[PDB]
Structure formats: structure tokens, C-alpha cells
């Protein structure tokens, strides 16, 4: 039994970070793989383990998913998630959602409760709200760090 996680790949410079900044990432990554290793150890499903690990990465403002989502060219947030169950080969996905705190949870909902693999935009949101998921403002995903990265990407 085994888990891996990622919090995204790309242009990270050692020159751009203090050890104390890098340690927040290492601490966040260890705490989430730990949660998953314990779930696995306890006999939780691969599906509930990747769902919880990605919901935690979503909650963590360090990672570009849920809270700490990057900003679009329009200074908005637009979130996408997928889950796939290797046992049934069932899959579910949402794209272009702004009002769902945990997209991977809406993805799971679509996988379990939709004839379709994929829903988009307000329709995906309304599907999720029709099944008890709460509506949030896109403002909750916004962080100072990701905003400054937008201005730097512009500038």
C-alpha cells in the first residue's frame, strides 16, 4: 500500500526562497502524505485516500488548487478537478468552477451521481448545490502570493 502527492511542477529557484519558506512546503507535503499513509495503513480505499489528500492540497494556500488558486488574466479564479476509480474505471470531473470550495469533492460527486464524466461552469456548480455542496465566493481562493505572481507575470 502506497501514496504519492504533488503540489505542481515548474520554475522554482533556490535563489528565490529562504530555507524557512521551503520548509513550509516540505512540512505541508509531509503532513498530507502522512494523513494518506495512515488512511491506507488503516484500510481506507485508494479513492477516499486520493480524495482526502487532494482536498488537503486544495485547503493548503501554498498549492495552486482551491485556496491559493492562481489568478486568470481577468483577476478571477477558475478551478478544475478530476477523480478516477481504478476499481470501477469510473471517473468524474468539473472544469471552470468558481463557487465550489473543493473541486475534487464536486468531481467525486459527478463521478458517483452523474451519467457524465464531466460538467462545466455554473451547470457543474448547480449540480453540486442540488446535492448539498455549499456555494462560496471566488474571493476565498485569493492569496497575496498568487496575486503578486500575477502582476510579475504581467510585468
Amino acid at each position: 500500500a502506497v501514496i504519492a502527492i504533488h503540489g505542481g511542477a515548474g520554475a522554482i529557484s533556490r535563489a528565490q526562497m529562504s530555507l524557512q519558506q521551503e520548509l513550509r512546503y516540505i512540512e505541508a507535503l509531509s503532513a498530507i502524505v502522512e494523513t494518506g499513509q495512515k488512511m491506507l495503513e488503516a484500510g481506507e480505499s485508494a479513492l477516499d485516500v486520493v480524495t482526502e489528500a487532494v482536498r488537503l492540497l486544495e485547503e493548503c494556500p501554498l498549492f495552486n488548487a482551491g485556496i491559493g488558486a492562481v489568478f486568470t488574466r481577468d483577476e478571477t479564479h477558475e478551478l478544475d478537478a478530476c477523480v478516477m476509480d481504478g476499481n470501477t474505471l469510473k471517473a468524474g470531473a468539473v472544469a471552470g468552477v468558481s463557487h465550489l470550495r473543493n473541486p475534487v469533492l464536486a468531481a467525486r460527486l459527478v463521478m458517483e451521481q452523474s451519467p457524465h464524466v464531466m460538467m462545466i461552469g455554473e451547470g457543474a456548480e448547480n449540480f453540486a448545490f442540488a446535492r448539498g455542496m455549499e456555494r462560496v465566493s471566488p474571493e476565498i481562493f485569493s492569496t497575496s502570493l498568487r496575486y503578486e505572481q500575477l502582476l510579475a507575470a504581467r510585468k
Binding site: 486520493v50 481504478g86 471517473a91
Partner: protein, 135 residues
Amino acid sequence: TVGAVALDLDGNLAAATSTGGMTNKLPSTVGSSPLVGAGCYANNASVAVSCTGTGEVFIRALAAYDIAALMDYGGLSLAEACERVVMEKLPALGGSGGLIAIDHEGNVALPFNTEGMYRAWGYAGDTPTTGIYRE
């Protein structure tokens, strides 16, 4: 982008991928993250994959499924399949990024062609490994 793959004590593989996309992206664009076979794939007979990086390339190369196909049909090992996709085929399409893969035999791979990939893995009942930079 963020991602999780897992093999449970029952031999089940599962994958999940979540993102807010690319900084400064054009609104109503869709990268690999919500697309089965591009940014997320799982099959008990093969592998579970989460991907992160240039979405148009991950979609065009079907990166997640291509790991499964290279193994199932090409008889590449997980390590071979992850090398070929991330180190050869993504760059050939102008693509950069990485993925996390676990096969049904518990092999784990976390390839990336980027400067870093925030990453972690661990067997159950065992000490996790974490990484940011290359090696």
C-alpha cells in the same frame, strides 16, 4: 496543480488532480487537469497517474493514459514509461512538467523535466519522502 495517486491494501489504484490553472490564463481555457487520460487516469490492471504542467501538451500527448498504454501494450516498466513520456514526448511537443504514478505492483515514480515539483510519497507503515528540487 495538485495531485494524489494511491494503491490501497485491497490492490485498488485511484488518482485525483485539482488546479486553478495557469497564472494569467485566458478565461474559459481547459488544461489537462479535468481531462481523463491527460491530467488524471487510474486502472487496477495498470497504473494511477496525476499530471502537472503545460496543459495543451499533456492533453495532446494523453500523458496519464500514455503511461498505462506504454506499460500494458509496449511492455515498458513504470520507470521506463515515465522517463519516455516526461523526458522525451512532452518536450518534443514543446511541453514542460511532471507526474506521479503508482502501478498495480506498488512501483512509484515522480518524474519531472521542470526546475522543481512539490512532491511526496510513502509506503504505509513507513517514513515518507519529500522533494522540491531535482534528484
